[PDB]
Amino acid sequence: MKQYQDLIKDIFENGYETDDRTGTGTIALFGSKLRWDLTKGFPAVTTKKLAWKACIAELIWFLSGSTNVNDLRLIQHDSLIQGKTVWDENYENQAKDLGYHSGELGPIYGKQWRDFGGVDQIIEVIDRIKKLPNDRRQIVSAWNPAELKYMALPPCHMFYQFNVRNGYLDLQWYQRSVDVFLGLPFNIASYATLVHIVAKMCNLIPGDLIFSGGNTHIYMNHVEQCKEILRREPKELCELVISGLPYKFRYLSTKEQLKYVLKLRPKDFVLNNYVSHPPIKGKMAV
Amino acid sequence: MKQYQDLIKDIFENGYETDDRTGTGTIALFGSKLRWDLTKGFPAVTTKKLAWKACIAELIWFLSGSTNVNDLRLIQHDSLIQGKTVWDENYENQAKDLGYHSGELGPIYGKQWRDFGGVDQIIEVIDRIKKLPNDRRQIVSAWNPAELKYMALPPCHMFYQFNVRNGYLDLQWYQRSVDVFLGLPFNIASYATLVHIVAKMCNLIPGDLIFSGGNTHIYMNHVEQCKEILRREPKELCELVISGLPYKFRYLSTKEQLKYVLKLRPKDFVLNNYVSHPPIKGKMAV
Numbered sequence: 001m002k003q004y005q006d007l008i009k010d011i012f013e014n015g016y017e018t019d020d021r022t023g024t025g026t027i028a029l030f031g032s033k034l035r036w037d038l039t040k041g042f043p044a045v046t047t048k049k050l051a052w053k054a055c056i057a058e059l060i061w062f063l064s065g066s067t068n069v070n071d072l073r074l075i076q077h078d079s080l081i082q083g084k085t086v087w088d089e090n091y092e093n094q095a096k097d098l099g100y101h102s103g104e105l106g107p108i109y110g111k112q113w114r115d116f117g118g119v120d121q122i123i124e125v126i127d128r129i130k131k132l133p134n135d136r137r138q139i140v141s142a143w144n145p146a147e148l149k150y151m152a153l154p155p156c157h158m159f160y161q162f163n164v165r166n167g168y169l170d171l172q173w174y175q176r177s178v179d180v181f182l183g184l185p186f187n188i189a190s191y192a193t194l195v196h197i198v199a200k201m202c203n204l205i206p207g208d209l210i211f212s213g214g215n216t217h218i219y220m221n222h223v224e225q226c227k228e229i230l231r232r233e234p235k236e237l238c239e240l241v242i243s244g245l246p247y248k249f250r251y252l253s254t255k256e257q258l259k260y261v262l263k264l265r266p267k268d269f270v271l272n273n274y275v276s277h278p279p280i281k282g283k284m285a286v
Numbered sequence: 287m288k289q290y291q292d293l294i295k296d297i298f299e300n301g302y303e304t305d306d307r308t309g310t311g312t313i314a315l316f317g318s319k320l321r322w323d324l325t326k327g328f329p330a331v332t333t334k335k336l337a338w339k340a341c342i343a344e345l346i347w348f349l350s351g352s353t354n355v356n357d358l359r360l361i362q363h364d365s366l367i368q369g370k371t372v373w374d375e376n377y378e379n380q381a382k383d384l385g386y387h388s389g390e391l392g393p394i395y396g397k398q399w400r401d402f403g404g405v406d407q408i409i410e411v412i413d414r415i416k417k418l419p420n421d422r423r424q425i426v427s428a429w430n431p432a433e434l435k436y437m438a439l440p441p442c443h444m445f446y447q448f449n450v451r452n453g454y455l456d457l458q459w460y461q462r463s464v465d466v467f468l469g470l471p472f473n474i475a476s477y478a479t480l481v482h483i484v485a486k487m488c489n490l491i492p493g494d495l496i497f498s499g500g501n502t503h504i505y506m507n508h509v510e511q512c513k514e515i516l517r518r519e520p521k522e523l524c525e526l527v528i529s530g531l532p533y534k535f536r537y538l539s540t541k542e543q544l545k546y547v548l549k550l551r552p553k554d555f556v557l558n559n560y561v562s563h564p565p566i567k568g569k570m571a572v
Contacts, residue, residue: 016451016452018420018452019420020420021418021420021421021422023420030447030449030456030458030494030496031319031321031449031456031458031494031496033317033319033498035317116431116432117430117431117432117433118432119431119432121431132307134304134305134306134307134309135307136307136462136463136500136501137434137440137462139429139444139462140431141427141429141431141444141445143425143427144403145402145403145405145407145426145427146402146403146404146405147403148423154423158425158427159427159445159460161316161460161462161500161501163316163317163500163501165302166302166304170316170317172316172317172500174445174447174460174498176422176423176425176447177422208316208317210316210317212319212460212498214422214447214449214458215422215447215449
């Protein structure tokens with residue numbers, strides 16, 4: 001892949017080394033977009049052994065309409081209790097700070113996918129693709145103005161449009177704020193897998209992946225370690241294979257196709273002779 | 287300005303000369319973005335005497351929370367009855383086809399700006415800018431999944447993010463489908479004027495204008511007349527001045543600032559020594 005290396009550099013010349021909300025300093029640029037051909041490989045850029053298994057588990061949970069953290073524990077960890085997870089120290093303060101207890105995050109992404117005002121928008125957006133493919137309204141908004149008030153973290157990824165080529169499916173997200181250092185990697189992968197799963201239901205060839213950015217930012221946290229991801233040429237990229245889904249699958253009714261989807265825990269998604277790179281550390285919670 | 291001339295050409299090489307919904311053929315590309323510096327002039331690209339007065343009147347109406355067509359007639363035409371308008375042959379079939387009568391379009395843009403689920407999102411997004419400026423959540427979604435069902439035309443322009451520079455205001459829209467031939471011009475202008483009006487309330491310098499595209503398309507309707515807009519160098523661009531707003535204005539409470547805004551009919555917005563070009567004809571209804 002090529003275009004990720006570029007963006008990072010172009011945020012440098014951006015100009016605005018600026019103050020922000022829970023201030024310190026950031027160098028950041030408002031207004032980015034990139035495009036990926038999944039045809040020419042699976043774009044999920046490694047380095048740091050990407051905790052991808054927990055990225056795969058958040059996406060499935062998201063697709064289940066859940067909002068209780070222990071459910072996510074069950075998908076990742078086959079255990080409702082043992083095992084940290086990506087929303088834990090996020091529930092333990094922002095969500096518990098609203099009054100919630102042992103489980104709820106509030107009307108988070110999953111619920112707005114499966115229930116925005118009673119519109120089950122996952123199940124029915126896979127029908128427009130199945131049925132009016134070259135339609136343009138095949139969108140799933142997650143920002144619910146009227147329910148922002150009850151959520152732990154209002155969605156950073158809030159919107160997306162699908163486009164049908166002549167045999168390819170394309171997805172495009174809009175993200176409000178991104179941490180290119182340690183965010184944008186987990187997000188490239190989540191919708192890359194979503195255009196895979198939906199292309200397997202619609203039996204379309206996964207096509208291109210486009211990303212629209214709002215406040216793309218790099219934090220002022222001693223950038224020399226992020227810097228290191230410059231100048232390299234990716235050569236051997238990852239194959240992109242899902243398992244456990246029964247042969248009848250692509251003919252099954254949309255509502256019956258997610259039923260089976262949701263039965264896959266993260267072992268079922270795997271990559272062939274995927275580029276190694278080591279894992280260093282250092283993180284900050286979004 | 288420069289980047290508009292480019293995009294048009296780059297849709298040509300796109301590949302997909304394709305069938306669509308109310309089919310014929312189109313050449314179209316999914317995934318565009320452009321950026322405009324209003325500092326270096328008012329970007330509204332002329333040619334065809336842009337029926338800009340009706341673009342200015344739709345925006346104010348939008349900002350009034352209305353959804354009744356005659357109200358728009360009042361703003362443009364100072365008359366609840368005499369004078370065509372941009373949503374007329376749109377109400378006269380799509381809206382009347384739902385049952386509506388003499389006036390309603392259904393829960394159109396204006397209502398989702400002023401009332402999405404009871405969130406009055408114009409009035410309160412101008413407070414975040416006034417008050418937490420370097421916040422990232424200062425978004426106004428118009429796509430309401432749960433109320434698409436009652437609208438004449440579900441919004442083509444559905445989303446937008448504002449960003450505060452250090453003294454500039456920036457806006458970015460996402461548009462589901464665009465008719466670059468005869469659409470995208472009326473839209474460049476509508477949010478260009480919206481970053482003006484909101485920069486005058488927030489007393490910020492209008493900054494950059496960015497546009498995210500979904501299905502950017504040119505219709506297969508004998509393109510040689512659109513072609514003509516290639517190869518020219520814009521030189522003298524339009525000054526961008528609003529009138530009638532009382533000197534106290536920039537200190538007035540947000541809710542009191544729109545009150546005055548809405549009192550301006552389209553005569554109050556005007557451009558200095560703005561590039562002439564003639565007006566030919568030919569249109570198709572979106």
